[PDB]
């Protein structure tokens, strides 16, 4: 079986959550996925799955145990409010934003920098000149 334990529990009403250290013992098993943990933690603390964040898990040398950090928000809304965007995308609470590589973005920024105004007039002018 797999046993989950929480320690160093600190209530943080300032961020409206509870922070703590997760210790999971998983004999005869590789390790536990974050979603599985978030499930167990959700029933343990009587909160929604979406209000549970878990991260920074390291399995001890030789296996059988892992240690990480866990946050349990008092609500889903406050969780979406505070919780990091990348972790929201990890849990599916937020959608990944599609953006170009910094090289193309910076090039485009400079290209716009050479242009003054909307530029529609330059377009129609070069159109009539051609």
């Amino acid at each position: 079986a797999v046993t989950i334990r929480t320690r160093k529990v600190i209530s943080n009403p300032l961020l409206a959550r509870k922070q703590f250290v997760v210790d999971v013992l998983h004999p005869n098993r590789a390790n536990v996925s974050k979603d599985e943990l978030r499930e167990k933690l959700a029933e343990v603390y009587k909160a929604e799955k979406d209000a549970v964040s878990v991260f920074g898990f390291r399995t001890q040398f030789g296996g059988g145990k892992s240690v990480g950090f866990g946050l349990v928000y008092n609500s889903v809304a406050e969780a979406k409010k505070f919780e990091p965007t990348y972790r929201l995308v990890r849990y599916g609470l937020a959608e990944k934003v599609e953006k170009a590589s910094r090289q193309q973005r910076k090039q485009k920024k400079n290209r716009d920098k050479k242009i003054f105004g909307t530029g529609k007039r330059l377009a129609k002018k070069v159109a009539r000149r051609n």
Binding site: A1, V2, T3, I4, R5, T6, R7, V9, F20, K40, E43, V44, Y45
Partner: peptide, 8 residues
């Protein structure tokens, strides 16, 4: 103090 749970 924390809480304990076991599954599977």
């Amino acid at each position: 103090k924390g809480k304990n749970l076991s599954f599977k």
